[PDB]
Amino acid sequence: ELQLRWQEYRELVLLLLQWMRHHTAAFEERFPSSFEEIEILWSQFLKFKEMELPAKEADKNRSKGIYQSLEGAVQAGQLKVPPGYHPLDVEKEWGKLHVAILEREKQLRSEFERLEALQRIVTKLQMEAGLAEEQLNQADALLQSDVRLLAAGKVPQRAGEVERDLDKADSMIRLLFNDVQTLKDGRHPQGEQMYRRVYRLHKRLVAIRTEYNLRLK
């Protein structure tokens, strides 16, 4: 009777408290490197929020109902409620879980927006890298045509222009290294790979500027 409902109430609240703490700690704990990863985390989150949580909410509210029938024995002292087992303590922990759930949902949308931002930067960097490349190609092509004029004992015509082209590629390569550092800061998983590619264009730049300094300056 009383011993029954007391038993049922304690069994229930014990499992509820274990579950809430378990899930509260799991939320304290997981940053995605890709959309593939964030999609799984989000799915897992929604599965929890929409499938597991309401069942536990039912148990919580059922435990409250069971306790109200025990309240006469509790007040009178026949039953002592262990610390942390009162409907007040269940609600406290339920509240902390609820807060952790909202924070996690906000962190997951914030992570999705970071991933979108990183993608913008990756597109921009790839577009700029093509232009920096073309700029090094145009600088190198002018240089060889001047060198070719320096074969036929003729004077260079585009020295001024080669200088400008190199100063442009330099400016663009510097924008590229800053995009790369923005990727790295954002922990894009290939940040490092992209650094090496930009470092390569920089190497090309130094090679072309050295040749230019040797031949035309």
UniProtKB/Swiss-Prot annotation:
It is found in: Cytoplasm, Cytoskeleton; Cell junction, Hemidesmosome; Cell projection, Podosome. Phosphorylated by CDK1; regulates dissociation from intermediate filaments during mitosis. Widely expressed with highest levels in muscle, heart, placenta and spinal cord. It comes from the Eukaryota. Belongs to the plakin or cytolinker family. Homodimer or homotetramer. Interacts (via actin-binding domain) with SYNE3. Interacts (via calponin-homology (CH) 1 domain) with VIM (via rod region). Interacts (via N-terminus) with DST isoform 2 (via N-terminus). Interacts with FER. Interacts with TOR1A. Interacts with ANK3. Identified in complexes that contain VIM, EZR, AHNAK, BFSP1, BFSP2, ANK2, PLEC, PRX and spectrin. Interacts with COL17A1. The N-terminus interacts with actin, the C-terminus with vimentin, desmin, GFAP, cytokeratins, lamin B; whereas both the N- and the C-terminus can bind integrin beta-4. Interlinks intermediate filaments with microtubules and microfilaments and anchors intermediate filaments to desmosomes or hemidesmosomes. Could also bind muscle proteins such as actin to membrane complexes in muscle. May be involved not only in the filaments network, but also in the regulation of their dynamics. Structural component of muscle. Isoform 9 plays a major role in the maintenance of myofiber integrity. It is linked to Epidermolysis bullosa simplex 5C, with pyloric atresia: A form of epidermolysis bullosa, a genodermatosis characterized by recurrent blistering, fragility of the skin and mucosal epithelia, and erosions caused by minor mechanical trauma. EBS5C is an autosomal recessive disorder characterized by severe skin blistering at birth and congenital pyloric atresia. Death usually occurs in infancy. This is Plectin. The chain holds residues 413 to 630 of 4684 of the full protein.
